[PDB]
């Protein structure tokens, strides 16, 4: 820790105050997360148990590098690679013009790559959303904040009262599914892909039930044909309105047919049919991909 000089606080979150810092010996700039933890009650929290153990196995260009973990009597410092801001902050500032399409293409390509690496190493991210995606100035984007990420060597039992964040939750979670699957990360990403395109949230609900219905109203109320098992999902109700799917063209205007194709596959209602990250990468929407730089 003596080799690190604190430069400035760069926001907070889980763990507390994140600081930008510079290694005095190597010159490297770093993001320091500090976990005062509780040295009399709870110990290391699970978020850090998870983020550390899982990140240590996930070395990828589109996943933030945990560079080090420093231990002492009563502090645990985590040293991460530095990236100056998140997609949420970059979207709030790109409202007016919008993130240009080719930069959305490149962010989605990279995000799918990192998520593909996660899924194939049996890790569900679990909390994919714009504030948990970081960017540099050269056009890279990375999955961050693995605090809720979980290994799936055995299926992951869901929270009963979900915590993750309403607007990016998959309808299976909204319907009380018992286990998560890789698909829930895909749904989040597709909602994120939409949000970058149209500048608004895809399904900005105001309650769990309103969220379900905002989804049902846009993509149509699902049924056994579309989604084998729906009527049997724990929180399904026969009284749910049967909406007919509106036109997807008007839902994501700027997207060409290829983009709409990919988006609708990332938002399939049945989890087993939802496109995976691996296949999404071969989608034609990515044949003209480049790496532009954001302004």
């Amino acid at each position: 820790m003596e080799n690190f000089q604190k430069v400035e606080k760069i926001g907070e979150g889980t763990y507390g105050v994140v600081y930008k810092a510079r290694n005095k010996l190597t010159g490297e700039v770093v993001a320091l997360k500090k976990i005062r933890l509780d040295t009399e009650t709870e110990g290391v929290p699970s978020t850090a148990i998870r983020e550390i153990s899982l990140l240590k196995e996930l070395n990828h260009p589109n996943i933030v590098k945990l560079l080090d973990v420093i231990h002492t009597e009563n502090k645990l410092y985590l040293v991460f690679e530095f990236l100056h801001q998140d997609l949420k902050k970059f979207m709030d500032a790109s409202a007016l013009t919008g993130i240009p399409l080719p930069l959305i293409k490149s962010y989605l390509f990279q995000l799918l790559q990192g998520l593909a690496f996660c899924h194939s190493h049996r890790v569900l991210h679990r909390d994919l959303k714009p504030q948990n995606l970081l960017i540099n100035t050269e056009g890279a984007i990375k999955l961050a904040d693995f605090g809720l990420a979980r290994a799936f060597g055995v299926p992951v039992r869901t929270y009963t009262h979900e915590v993750v964040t309403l607007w990016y939750r998959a309808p299976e979670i909204l319907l009380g599914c018992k286990y998560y699957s890789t698909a829930v990360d895909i749904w989040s990403l597709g909602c994120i892909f939409a949000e970058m395109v149209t500048r608004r949230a895809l399904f900005p609900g105001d309650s769990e039930i309103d969220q379900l219905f905002r989804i049902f109203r846009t993509l149509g109320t699902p049924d056994e044909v579309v989604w084998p098992g729906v009527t049997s999902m724990p929180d399904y109700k026969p009284s749910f309105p049967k909406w007919a799917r509106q036109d997807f063209s008007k839902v994501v205007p700027p997207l060409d047919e290829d983009g709409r194709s990919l988006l609708s596959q990332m938002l399939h209602y049945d989890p087993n049919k939802r496109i995976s990250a691996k296949a999404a990468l071969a989608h034609p929407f990515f044949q003209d991909v480049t790496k532009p730089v954001p302004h």
């Binding site: 153990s53 049996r122 699957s181």
Partner: protein, 258 residues
């Protein structure tokens, strides 16, 4: 999305070799022994029942404990502190919300303080280098169960049951990787309920032939026959519940007819 079913199984096979403990370890431990390791794991089986924890959490805690005694000498009076710490860590990693530290302390009857528990947590994490995502027998079985034709609930419970028994006895089971024990228990449970055999699917999936499974399987058969006698019995008691179709009862085949 089983486009990763392959990769996951492949990756867990890669990680089980990296999360393996020193086979010899109990030998080079001047105060603790297998039989005491046996009592501790049997105890964790019940701490698990008391707090209605996942079997995976129980498997994970055993892996941590072995990997920890592989590098650190522990006196018998502190053994229960290692394990107690490993269950907390395992609980934090695997459970939706872990038990409070204070409960892990309570179940010891104050043989350790809350701070001593937290301190050991910390030490367990240094020694393990935060490598808590260890593959387990229970993880391999689950992956194997997708290849049954079709799923026989009694076969799943009983395989699970035999997998736990193997946690109790470093005695032989530390010499096999989790996937092999998993293989052996599945063949054994299947064989016990129906008379069928390590399916071709799995042979093709695992790269394991029945013959490759034969040493561990003979050990596991011995353990199954000998189980009503064992000093430790929390597992059999756990598996008498309707939850597992009481498989713990059915009579072990006296021969493997292998």
């Amino acid at each position: 999305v089983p486009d990763y079913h392959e990769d996951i199984h492949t990756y867990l096979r890669e990680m089980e070799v990296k999360c393996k403990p020193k086979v010899g370890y109990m030998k080079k431990q001047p105060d603790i022994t297998n039989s005491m390791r046996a009592i501790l794991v049997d105890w964790l089986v019940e701490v698990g029942e008391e707090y209605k924890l996942q079997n995976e959490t129980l498997h994970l805690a055993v892996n941590y404990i072995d990997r920890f005694l592989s590098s650190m000498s522990v006196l018998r009076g502190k053994l229960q502190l290692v394990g107690t710490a490993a269950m907390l860590l395992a609980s934090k990693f695997e459970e939706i919300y872990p038990p409070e530290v204070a409960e892990f302390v309570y179940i010891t009857d104050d043989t350790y303080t809350k701070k001593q528990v937290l301190r050991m947590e910390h030490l367990v994490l240094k020694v393990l280098t935060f490598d808590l995502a260890a593959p387990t027998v229970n993880q391999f079985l689950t992956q194997y169960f997708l290849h049954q034709q079709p799923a026989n609930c009694k076969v799943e419970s009983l395989a699970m049951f035999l997998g736990e028994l193997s946690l109790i006895d470093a005695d032989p089971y530390l010499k096999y990787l989790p996937s092999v024990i998993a293989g052996a228990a599945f063949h054994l449970a299947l064989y016990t309920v129906t008379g069928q055999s390590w399916p071709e699917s799995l042979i093709r999936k695992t790269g394991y032939t029945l013959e490759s499974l034969k040493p561990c399987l003979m050990d596991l058969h011995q353990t199954y026959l000998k189980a009503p006698q064992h000093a430790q019995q929390s597992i059999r008691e756990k598996y008498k519940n309707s939850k597992y179709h009481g498989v713990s009862l059915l009579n072990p085949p006296e021969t493997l007819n292998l």
